[PDB]
Design a protein around this ligand. Structure first.
Ligand SMILES: [Mg+2]
Ligand SMILES: [Mg+2]
Ligand SMILES: [Mg+2]
Ligand SMILES: [Mg+2]
Ligand SMILES: [Mg+2]
Ligand SMILES: [Mg+2]
Ligand SMILES: [Mg+2]
Ligand SMILES: [Mg+2]
Ligand SMILES: [Mg+2]
Ligand SMILES: [Mg+2]
Ligand SMILES: [Mg+2]
Ligand SMILES: [Mg+2]
Ligand SMILES: [Mg+2]
Ligand SMILES: [Mg+2]
Ligand SMILES: [Mg+2]
Lengths: 70, 94, 102, 156, 120, 85
RNA sequence: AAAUAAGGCCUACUUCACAAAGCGCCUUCCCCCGUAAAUGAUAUCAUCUCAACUUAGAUACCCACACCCAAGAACAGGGUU
RNA sequence: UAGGGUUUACGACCUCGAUGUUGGAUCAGGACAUCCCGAUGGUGCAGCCGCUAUUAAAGGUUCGUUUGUUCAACGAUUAAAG
RNA sequence: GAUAGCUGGUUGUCCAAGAUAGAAUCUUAGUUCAACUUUAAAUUUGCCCACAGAACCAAAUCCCCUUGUAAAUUUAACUGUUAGUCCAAAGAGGAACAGCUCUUUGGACACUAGGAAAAAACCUUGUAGAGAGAGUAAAAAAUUUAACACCCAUAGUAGGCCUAAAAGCAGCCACCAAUUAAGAAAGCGUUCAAGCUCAACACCAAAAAUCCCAAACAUAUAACUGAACUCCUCACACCCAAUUG
């Protein structure tokens, strides 16, 4: 119940870098893993939409907020 | 049925090419980057008058190094070690 | 081909792209204002004079009478002392309501 | 600014709403504690990890083979510890970093079996009437790896 | 005849609106730029190719730093349509003798001297 | 693809000076650190050369500014001296 | 009633004969979009509809060895009481 | 202002270590800027004979005298010898 | 074994550099010089350079210090190129036509890569290998003009000049003004007048011949896909015609 562009965008918007080969392998031999990934992608999409609509103040998405590095 | 003259990209008549949204967005972002570069290129720091000889020493040193490397152009040396080791092609055992 | 031609020369790809990107973009009214909010003095003076001099004024609906019929009516009204009048209604309604003639 | 219900008054997609942050964090902590207890009880079976080695993400599980197209300079028969894992799990639970996971959380044990070469690959180039005919043979190096097991700790 | 395209003086004149839009400022301006070729040298005149070769931008998408002086300014403007320019602002002091092995460029021009591999 | 990475400043390409590539790939089972890779050493040398060039350019600019200031001061002193006598 | 093009035949007529052919004889059937008209609004007139609705507005052949042949180069087909 | 490459040229782009040159015979495929068989509007339409504009190509498009010439003159036909 | 500016061909592996302004020639299908290119070597300045400097009858161009750089002059060799095509601008003749003939400035093609359908010349992009990796440059045509505010007509009269006649329109003049409130008349039709409206008042773009040619949807949240371009593990001399080393 998702699309490839939005799914890839939501997966990239979570610091969860995963190539396409591993994604296909999981979808083939691990339906539950891909289901959880799709759920996380939909949650990130909804959080981003809510943020763009209300500009946050001050949730900033429980799943968003990338981990900074130095 | 659409018969047109030879070669569609030259001549008096050519197939009319139309622009899409991809090329439009590409040109827009390119113009934005160009305007950013223009803005960044509008604030000098030395005003020319302050750069009448602040690094000529480095240029002279680099030129001297290049000249020394060029003048060093000479054939290699020679040694008897290789000429004597070449005789080992007939190395014999007991 | 030459520079100037009788027909419209096909512009280059980059030229057409620049011409299309540099098009005119008019403003976008967020609300659009389309969905937002002499002789008459002489007429009034004459109507006031008539109202002041209307000792015995009458009203009819003369319209079906031809020009010759109107001329005959004017002749009859000139025989016996009496005059006719023809004034508008747009300028007469305000004075009508103001003269307490409900 | 009321809008009567029409075919375009509201968007077509369902307007969902997210829960509060306090309850969300509470549920997150509860699920984390549940997963920690499940891991401590030893309920998992046959773990799998996505090891990003040799610039490639391999869906590693257990007792599987991997062949890399380069040299690592390691004597055949030595244990190796891989890192950069970012997708560990098994059944009824999963784990993934942001991106990489903690070192003390995952431990991938691997070994070396052999260091062979690739089959004789042929290179060739040709053109039209340009007398262009180039040939070359290449035999890049290869290796073999075997992941013994994938341990896990309750570090959460 | 396609001659050497020149640029007038009214172009390079930052206005208050431009300064407000970007982060740069007139007083105390940057001293170095972050040149990064984003366009190939082909399909361009020969003088532009020579300028690109002199600037040292053979491999595209590669960072490069040059002096912010009138000469280098004009040299950059000559190919402005083929390179990306950005200021090199150092949050901390310049790289000392001790801060030369652990460094990083980082996007948006931010040369960090304490480059580590751990989360905040 | 994901251009959003540039908004946060974590390299447009995920394989760019990030923790997914700079971090050592493998390591000895006993915990010993594996030797550095050739690509990592090349990137380190490139960064060192870049920093050296930046420092050299900054020092050259500072020296030029100081020389210009000294020349201006010398010209002012010469003018002041010529004003007398 | 005659021809045109197509589908058949030798019993009368001919070239002629144990046949075939025409000069000789039989048959050939469905409307085609271009217009003119009820009823009313944008345009309470009027008005044929790039508004809603009504007028001139597929039938045909078929799908169980060996001798002769009107069937056929062979192959194949029809008959062999 | 739009469509034509069917006439005269214009350019020589592969085809001079070969594409055999016009008419006339059998066979005709296609397009309508439609001569005729079907249907309409107007008309200097009292009717035929006429003229104009749209659709319809399912069909038809003769027999002969001359010049080698498609073209070029003439005798008789059918609604027509495009 | 004639000659021949001429047709044809001129044998194994791999690396690198490698496209020319013109002149003469019983000559433009051929030759030389010049110019481009290659090898070994001695020398130092080669290019964008900044104020300025460079004519009476527009893009521009020459010299040009700091500044990016590492390229340039010469010596001694000698083969190879010296018929070009397309694109943007100045053009020249032609028809302000030709895949039409010739120059000036830049790019491409003769050299691979990803697209515009099959394309040399159009857009993007070059240092050369592997991996079953990641990020990007160029990249998908849009669009339907025609009604209309359609209520309603006395008269000084056929004003005067010519017009046997045009009185309101064969031609010229002033164009007043009574109707309660508006044309010596703005069209239509009259030989000529007769009749019909109007100005104003009272609500008021397509067609050529074998047969049209990628299926196809206006309504799930802007971002994806997309190279031999950049990066990831290793080592790198291993993608130009002729010619050369
Ligand atoms: Mg063609
Ligand atoms: Mg030719
Ligand atoms: Mg020939
Ligand atoms: Mg020949
Ligand atoms: Mg031949
Ligand atoms: Mg027609
Ligand atoms: Mg000979
Ligand atoms: Mg000769
Ligand atoms: Mg030949
Ligand atoms: Mg031989
Ligand atoms: Mg080469
Ligand atoms: Mg002579
Ligand atoms: Mg020519
Ligand atoms: Mg080529
Ligand atoms: Mg490369």
């Amino acid at each position: 119940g998702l699309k490839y562009p939005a799914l890839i965008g939501n997966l990239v918007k979570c610091q969860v870098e995963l190539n396409r080969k591993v994604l296909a392998d999981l979808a083939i031999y691990e339906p539950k893993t891909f289901k959880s990934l799709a759920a996380l992608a939909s949650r990130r999409r909804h959080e981003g939409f809510a943020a763009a609509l209300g500009d946050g103040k001050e949730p900033e998405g429980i799943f968003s907020r990338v981990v900074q590095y130095h | 049925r659409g018969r047109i003259p030879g070669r569609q990209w030259i001549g008096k008549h050519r197939r009319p090419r139309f622009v899409s949204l991809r090329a439009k967005q590409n040109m827009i972002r390119r113009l934005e980057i160009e305007a950013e570069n223009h803005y960044w290129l509008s604030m000098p720091y030395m005003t020319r008058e302050q750069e009448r000889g602040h690094a000529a020493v480095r240029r002279r040193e680099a030129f001297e190094a290049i000249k020394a490397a060029a003048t060093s152009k000479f054939p290699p040396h020679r040694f008897i070690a290789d000429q004597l080791d070449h005789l080992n092609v007939t190395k014999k055992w007991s | 081909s030459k520079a100037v031609t009788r027909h419209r020369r096909v512009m280059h790809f980059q030229r057409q792209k620049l011409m299309a990107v540099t098009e005119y973009i008019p403003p976008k009214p967020a609300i659009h204002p389309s969905c937002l909010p002499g002789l008459i003095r002489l007429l009034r003076r004459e109507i006031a004079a008539v109202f002041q001099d209307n000792r015995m004024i009458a009203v009819c609906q003369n319209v079906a009478l031809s020009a010759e019929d109107k001329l005959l009516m004017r002749h009859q009204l000139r025989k016996h002392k009496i005059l006719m009048k023809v004034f508008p209604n747009q300028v007469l309604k305000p004075f009508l309501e103001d003269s307490k003639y409900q | 600014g009321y809008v009567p219900k029409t075919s375009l008054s509201s968007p077509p997609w369902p307007e969902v709403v997210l829960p509060d942050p306090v309850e969300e964090t509470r549920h997150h902590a509860e699920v984390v504690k549940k997963v920690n207890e499940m891991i401590v009880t030893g309920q998992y079976g046959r773990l799998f990890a996505v090891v990003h080695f040799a610039s490639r993400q391999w869906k590693v599980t257990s007792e599987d083979l991997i062949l890399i197209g380069n040299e690592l300079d390691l004597a055949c028969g030595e244990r190796i510890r891989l890192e950069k894992v970012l997708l560990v799990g098994a059944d009824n639970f999963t784990l993934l970093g942001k991106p990489l996971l903690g070192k003390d959380l995952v431990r991938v044990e691997a070994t070396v079996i052999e260091k062979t070469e690739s089959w004789p690959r042929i290179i060739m180039r040709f053109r039209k009437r340009k007398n262009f005919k180039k040939k070359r043979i290449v035999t890049t190096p290869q290796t073999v790896l075997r992941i013994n097991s994938i341990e896990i700790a309750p570090c959460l | 005849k396609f001659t050497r395209s020149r640029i007038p003086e009214k172009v390079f004149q930052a206005s208050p609106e431009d300064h407000e839009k970007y982060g740069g400022d007139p007083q105390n301006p940057h001293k170095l730029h972050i040149v990064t070729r984003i366009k190939s040298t082909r399909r361009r005149p020969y003088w532009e190719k020579d300028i690109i070769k002199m600037l040292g931008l053979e491999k595209a998408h590669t960072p490069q730093v040059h002096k912010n002086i009138p000469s280098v300014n004009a040299k950059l403007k000559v190919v402005k349509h083929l390179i990306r320019i950005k200021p090199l602002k150092l949050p901390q002091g310049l790289p000392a003798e001790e801060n030369m092995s652990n460094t990083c460029l980082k996007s948006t021009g931010e040369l960090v001297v304490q480059w580590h591999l751990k989360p905040v | 693809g994901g251009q959003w990475r540039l908004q946060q400043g974590l390299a447009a390409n995920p394989s760019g000076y990030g923790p997914l590539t700079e971090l050592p790939d493998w390591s000895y089972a006993d915990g010993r650190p594996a030797p550095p890779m050739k690509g990592q050493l090349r990137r380190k040398a490139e960064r060192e050369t870049f920093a050296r060039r930046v420092v050299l350019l900054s020092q050259e600019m500072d020296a030029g500014l100081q020389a210009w200031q000294l020349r201006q001061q010398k010209l002012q002193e010469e003018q002041r001296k010529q004003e007398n006598a």
